[PDB]
Amino acid sequence: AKVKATLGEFDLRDYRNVEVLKRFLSETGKILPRRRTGLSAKEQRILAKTIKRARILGLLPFTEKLVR
Amino acid sequence: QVASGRAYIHASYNNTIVTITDPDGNPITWSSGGVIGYKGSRKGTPYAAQLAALDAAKKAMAYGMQSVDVIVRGTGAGREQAIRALQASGLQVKSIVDDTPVPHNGCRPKKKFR
Amino acid sequence: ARRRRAEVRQLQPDLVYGDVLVTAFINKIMRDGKKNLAARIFYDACKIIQEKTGQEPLKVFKQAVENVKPRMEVRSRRVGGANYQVPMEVSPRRQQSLALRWLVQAANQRPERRAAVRIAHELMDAAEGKGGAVKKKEDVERMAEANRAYAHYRW
RNA sequence: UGGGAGAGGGUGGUGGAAUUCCCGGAGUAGCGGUGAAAUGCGCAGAUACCGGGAGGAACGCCGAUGGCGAAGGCAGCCACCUGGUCCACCCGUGACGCUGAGGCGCGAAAGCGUGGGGAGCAAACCGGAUUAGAUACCCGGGUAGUCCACGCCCUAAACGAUGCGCGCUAGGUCUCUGGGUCUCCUGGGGGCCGAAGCUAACGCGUUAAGCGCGCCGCCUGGGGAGUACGGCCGCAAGGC
RNA sequence: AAAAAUGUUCUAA
């Protein structure tokens, strides 16, 4: 199950789209790899940067702890 | 006295120190591989961490401590043994969460860790 | 052994009690092949225990043996460059053999003159949890309880 | 002309993790450390836990076998300024090109000067162990320095140990990034495997180490020696 | 995930 499938059409630069973007972070806050993300090379760079912005605006975590 | 609290497992390749706190994180009591007469390399073993956990809970339960949320730090070989010991002690282990400190590539480690 | 295990040698049951445990024991009493001498010692001791505390001696003998079986014992291991005291349980075979060994061994420690008295008196003490072969077995089990820290080095 | 990719460079700002320190709380007999130890630290309240504060450096995940750069080298994020480069259309100039002794500029780390900064780390140094010794490795401390600004130094396994440009000589496969008519076709990079051929062999092989041409740099047995003398550069170290 | 230093000269048949 990859995230590009589990989501319809989205904008890879709306750094304010928490509902879209948070789907791209593991349970432990890390930016998922393409093997999870499903984005291409070029798409993955765009997503991460806009993820990184949303972390600075407090919209996304930099890290969450791990629950069992 | 308090009923529920938190159980913290700091556990390196050297030792495993368990402190039980209260809901506010203020320590109720504590123990480690030193509180059971181990000194040296032995303080870092799984069994050392078990007795350390058992001495932690048996000291906290002796304060009415019933429910603990288990916060775990480090990676030492006494880590898993401590969690197992907390569920066997008698405490109502209500959670387990790994809060091991990890830098985002910050301070340069000692030569031992590069 | 390197290739396959050692196949445990089955002994002929002794002609008095029909017991392989008696046989292995008499073999532990035996020195230089003088089995009949060792047969007399075990049997003349068997009489004495039927005297002193009149009981079926085979039942006393099996209480001594049972009360000497060590359930744990330290063993040396390796990891990196260490030679620990690793607490490892004892196989039922080695359980029996250490008993038989320490039985005769600690019995020969005792101070009475003739052998069957030494054999009988240790089996009387060991069937009640006293005497040499017990203080050795218990002592072994004590050292393993101590090094339970190095139990995670058990294979 | 219209586009695209990018850790390319410079300046200002800025975010979170983490370590150290301080403060308050709470709490007690140890912590830390190693092969095992000791030194160290701790009842003068440490360690472990929570809350608050300060300051420095480095940017986890993304991240790659990736990208960019002439090389060294470049990685949070934001903006500004600036370079190179690629593609499309085939529009403009009309051989305006190639290379390049000198020259000039750039040039990892370390080092140097004047200020600043200093959390972590750590040459030197001290201590603990180890050992016959241990001016080492391992452990606890620790000053330069690591960081910033400006000015020097100009070295390197500065490597692809492979100068630059052009043309020519099978393909298969993976990838980055453009264009198309989007199967796939085509450019420009990045690797792999391999035709012919090259190679002392290893290997190279449209990213040539093949076939050619141009220009440059360099080699001419090892050691002495990258030393001496000279000269030039440098504050020095020392470079050429 | 590594305790422990060394082996006089010429000859290698």
Next chain:
RNA sequence: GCCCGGAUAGCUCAGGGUAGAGCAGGGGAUUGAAAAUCCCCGUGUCCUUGGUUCGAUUCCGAGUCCGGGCACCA
């Protein structure tokens, strides 16, 4: 000269009804060993003397010896 203290195993140190722990000692498991570890084992008129209590490490009185302390010194 007086105040405050100690004395308990070989060394230190714990203390009304126990006589203790660790380290030095010894055997033992261990190893190439030097150790670290692990087991058990010993080592008392609790300085002496008189009493308190049914009984004394403890309590008291005394002194015996050694520690600390302060003042003095014609």
